[PDB]
Design a binder for this molecule. Structure first.
Ligand SMILES: *[C@H](CC(=O)Nc1ccc(C(=O)Nc2cccc(Nc3ncc(Cl)c(-c4c[nH]c5ccccc45)n3)c2)cc1)CN(C)C
Lengths: 65, 279, 288
């Protein structure tokens, strides 16, 4: 009767988006504005904006009505 | 997200012919209502299209000079509201002058661009009494606009997908030495794409990618390897061909767009004002 | 309209709710921005642990929103002294809350009003996040957010320090508070003002140093506090196992980046350890 984690499987109809923690190690973060110390203090990192932008760029790219 | 959005589910249509059927149904239904209540006074669907294009340009002009500066997302949301509303409604029943302002008002609310109503109507080039009347009309039509959008208010625009594609190009496509020089021209194409029915026919990501590839082709840069290699389309050939055909169709939509003509617009505006004066 | 009024459910700070046929109806600036926020967000979301919007109607500038009728809320469960909350029940509530939050955060939306009364429970024991009148999209650098969000007893320390930009931590912290309220049956940090809220947080958990919160002093409303040593979590929650204490510590990390996300919380051993979460049909019901 135990619980096992299963990741959300939502079809994006587009190219795979690199994982959030991967972005910095993959060079993406070199192309977004660095988060200010206040932003980091609140928990806002440039990785979030980069990930959202990539997800929106790839969302539904392969989908046809 | 777009991939499970109301926009994808309900406001992305299969072809231009479907949009034509919707608009013709709206025009015919208004004609039937007018006949049942009560001649060349009625506008033809193509005249309705010319008027809708004219007033969409008017909405763009209104948003461009709006103070405080309207974010591009709000402008795109308002234009999408306008297109969707006049998919299923006639300009002869609801005047596009008021409807476009209601679109801008509702879009400002939806996209969390907090603007007071008096400073919203202060942007209108009208007298204070005229601004008050326009505000009253906008408030009357806000709920009508929301109902005619079927309570689907989130609009996915191509601007963030465009930014994400630029990030991806800078990261994974070094052959394009500086993707930023593609921006301006691509943005130009985006504007042209926004003038057509493409926003009702293609995904925001497809529109952004079409703009970027069109800008690249304009500069003599070929980025087919970006699609085939980086976007993993060498592993799925039918997907690559389908995306290429979607982009070609969008480019064709831009190519065959015809801006409204001033004399025809004046004649149609006279006809529209005659329609609204009566009934 | 097409719904007949059957009972008066209650009121909030923005609208009045009534039970109708079952559904629940929530009733110069135009249509209220809170109602529009709820409409625009709930129309784009479909998850079993997120309240489902069924309709909307109104006239002129007035509007009513229709939702599924939710039998009760977590606040009622917590306050019912006749109700016993076993570890399994707590695990079930926490699991459903975190699954809804994982879905919500995946779609780049912060609830920003998480609290037991905003976690509704139906007759089948399915928890649903509700009251999206404060919810907002995040991940956009150009959008500026106010720090007033979240009720004070559940407000994260970064918000109390005036953070304009923030992420999922503001929800997760509230989740932690909710978890604490599930474990103690009373509000964890019942401050009466922002300063007293920060004081209660620091007296219970300790004053965070630079190591625990690298950019703390840069927040616009940051004020230096007396160094409190805090109270060890096993002292506060004497009946909590090691896995549950690990989850609590992760949820109450002062650094919002280090604070565990909903996905990270769901993967923790506490949820996969014995005993398993209570099936929704077996969750306790506050009979009068
Ligand atoms: C004996 C039997 C008994 O126990 N009867 C009983 C107890 C308790 C309730 C109850 O909680 N009803 C209720 C009150 C308020 C709200 C709701 N559900 C609901 N559903 C959808 C939505 Cl969107 C909301 C909501 C969201 N935001 C809100 C703000 C304010 C109010 C609601 C709200 N709420 C259910 C019912 C029956 C008892 N006697 C002694 C015999």
């Amino acid at each position: 009767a135990l619980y096992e984690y299963q990741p959300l499987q939502i079809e994006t109809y587009g190219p795979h988006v690199p994982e959030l923690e991967m972005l910095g190690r993959l060079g993406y973060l070199n192309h977004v504005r660095a988060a200010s110390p206040q932003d980091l203090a609140g928990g806002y990192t440039s990785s979030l904006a980069c990930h959202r932008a990539l997800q929106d760029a790839f969302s539904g790219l392969f989908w046809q009505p | 997200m777009y991939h499970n959005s109301s926009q994808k589910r309900h406001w992305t249509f299969s072809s231009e012919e479907q949009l034509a059927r919707l608009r013709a149904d709206a025009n015919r239904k208004f004609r039937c209502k007018a006949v049942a209540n009560g001649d060349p006074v009625f506008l033809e669907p193509h005249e309705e299209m010319t008027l809708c294009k004219y007033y969409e340009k008017r909405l763009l002009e209104f948003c461009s000079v709006f103070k405080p500066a309207m974010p591009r997302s709000v402008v795109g949301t308002a234009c999408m509201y306008f297109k969707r509303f006049y998919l299923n409604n006639s300009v002869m029943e609801y005047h596009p002058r008021i409807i476009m302002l209601t679109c801008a008002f509702l879009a400002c609310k939806v996209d969390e661009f907090n603007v007071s109503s008096p400073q919203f109507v202060g942007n209108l080039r009208e007298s204070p009494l005229g601004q008050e009347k326009a505000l009253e009309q906008i408030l009357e039509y806000e709920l009508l606009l929301i109902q005619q959008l079927n309570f689907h208010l989130i609009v996915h625009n191509p601007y963030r997908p465009f930014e994400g594609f630029l990030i991806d190009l800078k990261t994974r496509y070094p052959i394009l030495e500086n993707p930023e020089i593609l921006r301006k021209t691509a943005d130009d194409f985006l504007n042209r794409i926004a003038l057509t029915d493409a926003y009702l026919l293609y995904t925001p990501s497809q529109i952004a990618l079409t703009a970027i590839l069109s800008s690249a082709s304009r500069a003599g840069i070929t980025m087919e390897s970006y699609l085939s290699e980086s976007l993993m389309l060498k592993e799925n050939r039918t997907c690559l061909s389908q995306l290429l055909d979607i982009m070609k169709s969008m480019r064709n939509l831009v190519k065959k767009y015809e801006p409204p003509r001033s004399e025809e617009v004046a004649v149609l505006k006279q006809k529209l004002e005659r329609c609204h004066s009566a009934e | 309209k097409r719904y007949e009024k059957l009972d008066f459910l209650g009121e909030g700070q923005f609208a009045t709710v009534y039970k109708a046929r079952i559904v629940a109806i929530k009733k110069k600036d135009g249509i209220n921005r809170t109602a529009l926020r709820e409409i625009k967000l709930l129309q784009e979301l479909s998850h079993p642990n997120i309240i489902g919007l069924l309709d909307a109607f109104g006239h002129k500038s007035n509007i009513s929103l229709v939702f599924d009728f939710m039998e009760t809320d977590l606040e009622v469960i917590i306050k019912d002294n006749s109700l016993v909350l076993t570890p399994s029940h707590i695990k079930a509530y926490m699991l459903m809350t975190l699954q809804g939050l994982e879905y919500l955060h995946q779609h780049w939306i912060l609830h920003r009003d998480l609290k037991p009364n905003n976690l509704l429970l139906d007759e089948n024991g399915v928890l649903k996040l509700a009251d999206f009148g404060l919810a907002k999209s995040f991940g956009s650098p150009n959008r500026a957010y106010t720090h007033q969000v979240v009720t004070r007893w559940y407000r994260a320390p970064e918000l109390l320090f005036g953070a304009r930009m923030y992420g999922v931590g503001v929800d997760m912290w509230a989740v932690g508070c909710i978890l604490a309220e599930l474990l103690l049956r009373v509000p964890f940090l019942p401050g009466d003002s922002d300063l007293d809220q920060l004081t209660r947080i620091f007296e219970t958990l300790g004053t965070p140093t630079e190591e625990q919160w690298p950019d703390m002093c840069s927040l616009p409303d940051y004020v230096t506090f007396k160094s409190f040593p805090g109270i060890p979590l096993h002292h506060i929650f004497s009946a909590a196992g090691d896995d549950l204490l690990d989850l609590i510590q992760g949820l109450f990390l002062f650094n919002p980046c280090a604070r565990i996300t909903a996905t990270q919380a769901l993967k923790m051993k506490y949820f996969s350890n014995r005993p398993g979460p209570t099936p929704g049909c077996q969750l306790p019901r506050p009979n009068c």
